[PDB]
Amino acid sequence: KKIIVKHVTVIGGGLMGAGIAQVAAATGHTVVLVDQTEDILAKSKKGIEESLRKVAKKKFAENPKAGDEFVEKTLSTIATSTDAASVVHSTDLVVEAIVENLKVKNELFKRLDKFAAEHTIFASNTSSLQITSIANATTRQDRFAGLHFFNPVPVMKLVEVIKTPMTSQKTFESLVDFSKALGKHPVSCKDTPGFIVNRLLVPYLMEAIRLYERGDASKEDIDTAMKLGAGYPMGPFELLDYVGLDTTKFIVDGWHEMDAENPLHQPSPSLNKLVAENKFGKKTGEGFYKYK
Amino acid sequence: SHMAFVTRQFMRSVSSSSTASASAKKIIVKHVTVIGGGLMGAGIAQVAAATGHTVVLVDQTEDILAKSKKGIEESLRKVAKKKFAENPKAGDEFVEKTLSTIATSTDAASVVHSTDLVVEAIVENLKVKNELFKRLDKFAAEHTIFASNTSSLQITSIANATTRQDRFAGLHFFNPVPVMKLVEVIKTPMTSQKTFESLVDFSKALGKHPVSCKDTPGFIVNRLLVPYLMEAIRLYERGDASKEDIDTAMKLGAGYPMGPFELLDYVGLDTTKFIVDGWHEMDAENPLHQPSPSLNKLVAENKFGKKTGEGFYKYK
Questions:
Q1: Which of A221, B69, B223, B299 lies at a 20 to 30 A Cα distance from A287?
Q2: How far apart are CA A109 and CA A90, in angstroms?
Q3: Cβ–Cβ of A196/B240 closer than 8 Å?
């Protein structure tokens, strides 16, 4: 009785949303990508194209026509719209990857709730909010789940599927199936702050910052230590810059707000200062380290 | 007056004579006494020997030492098959040469008078370590450096068992020692720069990358790794997610070679619990070192991880 997700609406053409769209389309799903303006959408779809093209040139060297066909077919199955309500009437799944603001998300989902078909599942890619809070902005909590991806979406194979206590098993299973259909590996977590990955990763990153701040070791030695001592692909400072200092701070800020006594979520002066100076990591050319 | 003095000192310090001299006073660690024939000490002895250092491996009886060295031989024979897949003779020579430079003695005091470096990798008990080092202090050559591989004690606490604190440091390796290319070199406030540089140099001579950390609990790696492993256990114990899913999440989500439960089994549940217990005892109010019932239970059952064929998971 569970739905097979075929037609997917992705809301938000940022890095995450565009990545989700790309992979869904690359795996035979029909995709409608939604954002605020045509200029934003054009840029998102262009980014998807370049990302697909890069892959194709490498993978289809011995068969360039197949490569071109793959890219073109994939892009073709990504439609765009600046009006979410107009596209969800018979979509199977909405995945929201927009600004991390409860009010904005709820306003979105409350509206979509009215226009989406009954069978439509709603999922949020949010890293900052409890799915439950967003789900209750609708009357379809049984069809509301967390579907949490990782940057870069076309590379990262994990998806966290998050049930609230109200999510149906049917909805959960549809999302597990959808995740596998994307070529990904779904794991399950309760609707708890940080789910699995961020819950275990982000506080560690904060601890690396705190160790540096105490004067105990250099950022460089800490990065080296984790790479050579723990086999991590990136040192925590490299990784902080890679995932975004603003992105990190915001998540920890949120955790700190809800649990101000918790040592793990104590703000970092160093992190705060970099974000205040708009040094956000790799994406601004400077975070803890300088890039160029 | 003082500005003049510092100026004279600086110009002297950059002079050919002073630079040649300082260079000439450097004592390269060539002879190493490794104390403890367990996984860590044997591994340290193995790498030191494989990289051209002369080693004495020390433990309590000949049988223990024979068995430790047998383990080293077996590890070297594996290295040899990889180094020289197509030449058994070259492999044999490597193994024999390496093994031959590892001597064994039951009393470290008998050899330290002519060693350059003692690396202690014995039981994590301050009293035992201190008894050891206070005694070796009497026998060791003046230039001899003392280092501990301890994961649960402050270097400073051990250093003060001796009167050579300027020549005492932490030198912290990772299992498997021959494979893991990191060494944490730990200065206490008393460790000299001479001692520190000799150990940095020794670390590189082992084919490893030394990093520096203050003599703080957990140094770098464990300080950042172990509390994360405890958090993973806690998330599981909360019932928020299964061990299997958490492992998958960290491998696929964070690119970790092993998820935290497999890694816990890998590094040892008893090993882990012992470290965190120490942290908990020292900082009882601290939430992060709160004992884990699951971890405690497994350790109580002698389910220590991969080394006993069962920890969080069952092996073999």
A1: B223
A2: 15
A3: yes
**Token pair 């206070």 is at which residue?**
B134
Catalytic site includes residue A198: yes
Report chain A residues whose CB lies below 8 A from the CB of B246.
Answer: 187, 196, 200
Q: Which amino acid is at B265?
A: D
CB-CB neighbours of A64 under 10 Å: 11
Distance in Å, alpha carbon of A115 to nearest chain B alpha carbon: 33
The structure tokens listed for B124 are: 């994590």
Distance between CA A118 and CA A120 in Å, rounded? 6
Interface residues of B toward A, Cβ cutoff 8 Å, are 174, 180-182, 184, 209, 211-214, 216, 219-221, 223-225, 227-228, 231-232, 235, 238-242, 245-246, 248-250, 252-258, 260, 286-288
Three-class secondary structure assignment of chain A: CCCCCCEEEEECCCHHHHHHHHHHHHCCCEEEEECCCHHHHHHHHHHHHHHHHHHHHHHCCCCHHHHHHHHHHHHHCEEEECCHHHHCCCCCEEEECCCCCHHHHHHHHHHHHHHCCCCCEEEECCCCCCHHHHHCCCCCHHHEEEEECCCCCCCCCEEEEEECCCCCHHHHHHHHHHHHHCCCEEEEEECCCCCCHHHHHHHHHHHHHHHHHCCCCCHHHHHHHHHHHHCCCCCHHHHHHHHCHHHHHHHHHHHHHHCCCCHHHCCCHHHHHHHHCCCCEHHHCECCCECC
Instruction: Provide the CATH number for the domain formed by B1-25 in this structure.
Output: 6.10.250.1150
Alpha-carbon distance A180 to B47, whole Å? 45
Interface test with B, best of A190, A216, A222 (most B CBs within 10 A): A216
For residue B185, report the phi and psi dihedrals to the nearest 5 degrees: -100, 120
Residues in contact with B6: Cβ distance below 8 Å, sequence separation at least 6, in sequence order: none
Which chain B residues are within 8 Å of A204, Cβ to Cβ?
224, 227-228, 231
| H/E element, B67 | helix B62-83
Experimental method: X-ray
Place domain B224-316 in its CATH homologous superfamily.
N-(1-d-carboxylethyl)-l-norvaline Dehydrogenase; domain 2 (1.10.1040.10)
* Resolution of the experimentally solved model in angstroms: 2.0
CA distance B296 to B302: 10
- The candidate with the shortest Cα–Cα distance to B58, out of B126, B141, B145, B117, is B117
SS3 state of residue B148: strand
Q: Which of B180, B196, B209, B211 is the best residue to mutate to test the A interface, defined by the most A CB atoms within 10 Å of its own CB? A: B211
Q: Name the superfamily (CATH) of residues B26-223.
A: NAD(P)-binding Rossmann-like Domain (3.40.50.720)
Side-chain-side CA neighbours of residue A146 (13 Å): 28
Q: Does domain A1-197 have CATH number 3.40.50.2000?
A: no
Structure tokens at B105: 């003695």
Q: Domain A201-292 maps to which CATH number in 2.30.180.10, 1.10.3810.10, 1.10.1040.10, 3.40.630.10?
A: 1.10.1040.10
Please identify which of the residues A7, A96, A124, A148 carries the catalytic annotation. Answer: A148
